[model samples]
Target: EPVVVVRSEKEIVVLTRFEEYHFDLEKGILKDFYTLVDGRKHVFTYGNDGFDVLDEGTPLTVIEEPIVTGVGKVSEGFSDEVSIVYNYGYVKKIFTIKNNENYTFFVDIESSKPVDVTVPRVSVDTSTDRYLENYFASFNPKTRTLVLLKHDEGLLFEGTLKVNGQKRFIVFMGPNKRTLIKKAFPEDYDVLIKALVNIPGFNKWYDSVFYGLVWFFWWLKDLTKNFGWAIMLFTLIVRLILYPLYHAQCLMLLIQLPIFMLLWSVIRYYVEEFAYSGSFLIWKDLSAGGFSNNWLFLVITIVASYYTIIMSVIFPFLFVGLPSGLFLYYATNTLIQLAVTY
Candidate 1:
């Protein structure tokens, strides 16, 4: 790959045969990243949780940032190693990359290189689809190595450091195209918290709700031929079902509102996962404040809400910023109860 360098007024671009990476010319934050194939770009990632030299192994913030002093190519080869140099007064951090489809790169810390380096050991969760995955990770503490596989993007990641807290860690990445797809490791990652959805029995609990709701969601969706109608109908169906089981009155709906919240969460989850990305509706997804755009729908929602079910809405909203799809259900559901009650 021909590793070449290009510059903008305020940004630096490393354009190569297989890669196109951009960074701020002054501050050394790597803001955007993409893999180029046939001159086309793909998913973006960043190095926010990158390398650091621990001073006393103490937690510190407000540290001085490195100045991106230089950018050019190093190493002569059929391969490419574009150097992004960061100057930190007394020390320099140079991250070198070769566009070999490995996503892997090396960093030379010329700081006497602290015995303890702080690098974010991130885990891969979430899919190439933002709805995401629960990837299993493999690691060996003695060897200080970890590996992650992106579930949908067909990407692999590997992380290794010295036998001790030494300089220059090794990263391993992937190029297994979708026909292309999408790591490294250090300490553990905050991704651990993000990936907490993978905890034992959690998915068991979540799937108990997720797939279960999806079944009903689709069952109703196909019944009416639209999720919009399905959501409205499902809301009434639940309250009406509870009516028989619990002799639902306005108070029955009062008890059912929590169910409404749960349903909304599930509905929003599906909208994000299955519905055309953010296409909760045409003007429907055009919701602002999770409230909708159709003034008629708005009038109906507000009127029904004020009359029938708002009633827990004030606080449920206090709890939920809410989603447009869910809003449709809540308002339309309350509208049904008004007739039944009257």
Candidate 2:
């Protein structure tokens, strides 16, 4: 069929060979974009605003026209145009399909004023059992692209945000399988990888540490067969390797605690009790306590002293104190073990 448009009592429906799009004709808003995955219904687009102002119940005329083979300009409006082009596994929007095998749809817009637009911003009932926590959105500044991944459902939404005199944006919604995301945009494949990999940290060291942990976890899991057992083994290995450093840290903490507490108490008392009203220190006016000079001085002193303690003392101590803490922890356990044995 050449892009069938069916108007129902509730909404307007557009059908292509691969996908189905729905719109609220009465309200002039998009409803959903539906596709099939392994005989199960997978609805990707939800709520409204599939296209910015058009999604906000703006008045528009829905026009459908066929232009070429395996492709058609399904709908046209006052300021927006929607198209459907068949691809290997997905459908593209507009009468033309350049990278038919990769892109899902294209939206063309003409604006008289500067306006902010969103593509598929809202979602429908994909079911409560699904982990919404796995749904993530990321933007790659290098490529000027946005990628939304729904890991639990294995759906990936990729698009480029372009700004110019007349703005245009393209969306490619597909499976989150390795092959699909890897091949979606051949030129921008590295950008996609960076988007996912660069999530934890921007620094090279952070990325290295994250990937290292991931690799270690997988390696241990394979050896142990049970993930929980693998985690325990990993923890034990780490503790054993860092035991000496931990012992030192504990000892340092024990040596530092008394000094730290004393300094903290002195600062607290000075801020709470005494403040320089003029050239001499006096008890702070607690009764008139709304942002006075004395209160301000007290606040500044409190913050400064707290930070000074952390940076000058606690941080240095941590380098040595952490081991001390761990040593005491293990020593106490050892004493308990000896008591039980006796």
Q: Which stretches of candidate 2 lie above 4 Å from their native place?
A: 1-5, 26-29, 54-103, 122-164, 197-342
| Span of 10 residues, lowest total lDDT, candidate 1 | 174-183
Q: All predictions: root-mean-square deviation over Cα?
A: 14.1, 22.0
Tell me the number of clashing residue pairs for each predicted model: 5, 15
lDDT of 1 by residue, 1-342 (tens): 356666678676766554556665443434455545324544344444344433444322222543333334344322345667776544455667665444455666555433333333322432211112323333322221233322221123222121122234343322321101121332333453245334322243445466567767666665575556566677676766766865422465467668766775665442332343223544554222464333344556566656543445353453236566555655565577567667
> For candidate 1, what is the lDDT?
0.46
Question: How many clashes show up in model 1?
Answer: 5
Per lDDT, the best of the predicted structures is 1
Best by TM-score: 1
Against the unseen true structure, what C-alpha lDDT does each candidate score? 0.46, 0.37
